[PDB]
Design an enzyme around this catalytic site. Structure first.
Site, short mmCIF file in Angstrom:
data_model
loop_
_atom_site.label_atom_id
_atom_site.label_comp_id
_atom_site.label_asym_id
_atom_site.label_seq_id
_atom_site.Cartn_x
_atom_site.Cartn_y
_atom_site.Cartn_z
N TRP A 42 0.84 -1.21 0.00
CA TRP A 42 0.00 0.00 0.00
C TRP A 42 0.87 1.26 0.00
O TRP A 42 1.38 1.56 -1.04
CB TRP A 42 -1.10 -0.06 1.06
CG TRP A 42 -0.75 -0.45 2.46
CD1 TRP A 42 -0.93 0.32 3.56
CD2 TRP A 42 -0.25 -1.71 2.94
NE1 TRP A 42 -0.54 -0.34 4.68
CE2 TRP A 42 -0.12 -1.59 4.34
CE3 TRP A 42 0.12 -2.92 2.36
CZ2 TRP A 42 0.35 -2.62 5.14
CZ3 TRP A 42 0.59 -3.94 3.15
CH2 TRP A 42 0.71 -3.79 4.52
N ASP A 43 1.16 1.82 1.17
CA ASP A 43 1.93 3.09 1.24
C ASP A 43 3.25 2.89 0.50
O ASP A 43 3.95 1.96 0.83
CB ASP A 43 2.24 3.50 2.68
CG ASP A 43 1.04 3.83 3.54
OD1 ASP A 43 -0.03 3.43 3.21
OD2 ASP A 43 1.22 4.49 4.53
N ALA A 129 4.99 3.43 7.95
CA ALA A 129 5.53 4.29 6.87
C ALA A 129 6.48 5.37 7.41
O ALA A 129 6.42 5.80 8.63
CB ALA A 129 4.38 4.89 6.10
N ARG A 199 2.86 9.08 13.66
CA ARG A 199 3.51 8.26 12.61
C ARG A 199 3.97 9.11 11.43
O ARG A 199 3.67 10.32 11.39
CB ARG A 199 2.57 7.15 12.11
CG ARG A 199 1.17 7.64 11.74
CD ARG A 199 0.30 6.50 11.24
NE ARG A 199 -1.06 6.87 10.92
CZ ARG A 199 -2.02 7.04 11.83
NH1 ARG A 199 -1.80 6.74 13.09
NH2 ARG A 199 -3.25 7.43 11.49
N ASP A 200 4.71 8.46 10.54
CA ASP A 200 4.97 8.94 9.16
C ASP A 200 5.96 10.09 9.12
O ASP A 200 5.66 11.21 8.67
CB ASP A 200 3.65 9.38 8.50
CG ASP A 200 2.58 8.31 8.36
OD1 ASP A 200 2.92 7.11 8.50
OD2 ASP A 200 1.37 8.70 8.09
N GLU A 284 -2.59 12.74 7.80
CA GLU A 284 -1.60 11.65 7.68
C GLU A 284 -0.55 11.98 6.65
O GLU A 284 -0.71 12.91 5.89
CB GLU A 284 -2.19 10.33 7.20
CG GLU A 284 -3.44 9.98 7.93
CD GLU A 284 -3.74 8.51 7.70
OE1 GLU A 284 -3.32 7.73 8.50
OE2 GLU A 284 -4.31 8.21 6.72
#
Ligand SMILES: OC[C@H]1O[C@@](CO)(OC[C@H]2O[C@](O)(CO)[C@@H](O)[C@@H]2O)[C@@H](O)[C@@H]1O
Ligand SMILES: [Zn+2]
Ligand SMILES: [Zn+2]
Length: 412
Positions: A42-43, A129, A199-200, A284
């Site tokens: 996905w990501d 991610a 996150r990220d 996000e």
């Protein structure tokens, strides 16, 4: 710390328009091809430098993906009738996430390279991610990523890329350094909210001050349900639009941290650049494009993470400023840059806007027949947008998973 976050307000969100063809991803073919019968991706995180440029090495483009096995022939992913439950498999993928790499001389028809990190290297089994940074022309790479469960921790791991005429190998991603978690005074913690977002990482160097920074998804600190919706969070809403329902539960922000030096081994948490209190819980995958002296700050969000009495499509939102620390203005006056079409509202996710105007995403769920849907777990067609001041325009469409480099680094 001498700046204030810019709020993405309720008034801005009231301007969000689905199905504006200048800000809508073209429909995904319900008969889309899948890049792998063995794995879901996905990501997708293209190899980049510290300014955001997508870089190839010795003519090889590289992408890193969140990756999980397809459990097509795994009894554990059969329903009560003994048939493969692709929905259960797909929805379970977050718990199985590992970072893998792929390569290509063309920026498409990706060759699978395998795991970046051997199993056990990552402090958490889940590898969520972030961003792979090519550090130099000796092939050193820092993969910034998120360690999830227990907790949520931004981390980095340094390895090397080696190339030949036949492909690419990644080597030495063996030592993860944990950098930081939510602090509780600026960014919300698990203690304050069991459903906290943290996150990220997206690092960059700002040439204006020469410092190494990172963006990340956070939430505004405070116990779940306690946040005040301020007049600055409301913005200039129209008559009749004062009722926010449970909007105090939506507290997303684009966080910022700065490295103590250019090694990026030690970080200082700073105030967020964008806050979405009363608007959206999830800002996000925040990332910059630096263009024409401007800071274009993109973030991905969901229809179903908008606060009560607001809505917008899944896709990519954005903001623009002349200065790193703002003030920011929403792109296209609402924030929306590239939304899913309302006939296929979940067709793609994790949109990632690159400085060449190309936007990659993965295929999520496309309506199929009656109430059936097709699950993707494969790259979506790349879209090209133009950034013109505080506006964007969709202007072209490319092949599935087309993610070319902007410049080619010759290794020494
Ligand atoms: O069984 C449904 C499930 O399988 C997938 C696998 O990609 O779709 C397969 C489905 O797509 C076609 O190949 C058309 O492109 C059909 O012939 C076949 O039945 C998933 O997307 C879907 O969730
Ligand atoms: Zn560059
Ligand atoms: Zn060098």
């Amino acid at each position: 710390f001498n700046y204030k976050p810019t709020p993405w307000t309720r008034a801005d969100a009231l301007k969000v328009h689905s199905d504006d063809p200048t800000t809508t991803q073209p429909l995904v073919d319900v008969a889309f091809p899948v890049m792998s019968e063995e794995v879901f991706i996905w990501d997708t995180m293209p190899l980049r430098d510290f300014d955001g440029d997508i870089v190839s090495v010795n003519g090889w483009c590289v992408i890193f993906t969140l990756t999980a096995d397809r459990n097509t022939n795994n009894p554990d992913f059969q329903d009560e009738n003994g048939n493969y439950d692709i929905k259960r498999d797909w929805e379970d993928r977050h718990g199985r996430a590992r970072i893998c790499y792929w390569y290509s001389r063309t920026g498409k028809d990706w060759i699978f390279g395998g795991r970046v990190m051997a199993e056990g290297v990552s402090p958490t089994t889940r590898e969520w991610a972030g961003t792979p940074i090519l550090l130099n022309d000796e092939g050193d790479i820092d993969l910034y990523y998120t360690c999830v469960t227990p907790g949520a921790t931004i981390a980095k791991v340094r390895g090397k890329i080696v190339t030949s005429d036949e492909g690419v190998s990644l080597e030495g991603f063996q030592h993860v350094k944990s950098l930081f978690s939510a602090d509780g005074k600026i960014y919300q913690t698990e203690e304050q909210n069991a459903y906290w977002n943290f996150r990220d990482p997206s690092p960059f160097i700002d040439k204006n001050d020469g410092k190494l920074y990172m963006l990340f998804e956070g939430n505004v600190a405070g116990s779940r349900g306690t946040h005040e919706i301020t007049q600055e969070d409301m913005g200039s809403v129209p008559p009749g639009y004062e009722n926010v329902g449970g909007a105090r539960y939506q507290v997303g922000c684009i966080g910022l941290a700065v490295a103590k030096d250019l090694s990026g081994d030690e970080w200082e948490i700073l105030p967020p650049l964008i806050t979405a209190v009363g608007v959206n819980d999830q800002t996000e995958r925040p990332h910059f494009v630096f263009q024409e002296g401007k800071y274009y700050l993109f973030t991905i969000s969901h229809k179903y993470t908008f606060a009560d009495n607001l809505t917008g499509p899944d896709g990519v939102y954005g903001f623009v400023s002349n200065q790193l620390t703002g003030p920011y203005t929403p792109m296209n006056s609402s924030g929306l840059v590239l939304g899913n079409p309302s006939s296929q509202p979940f067709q793609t996710y994790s949109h990632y806007v690159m400085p060449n105007g190309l936007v990659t995403s993965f295929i999520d769920s496309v309506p199929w027949e009656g109430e059936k849907f097709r699950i993707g777990g494969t790259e979506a067609p790349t879209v090209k947008i133009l950034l013109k001041g505080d506006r964007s325009f969709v202007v072209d469409s490319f092949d599935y998973g087309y993610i070319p480099a902007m410049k080619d680094i010759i290794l020494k």
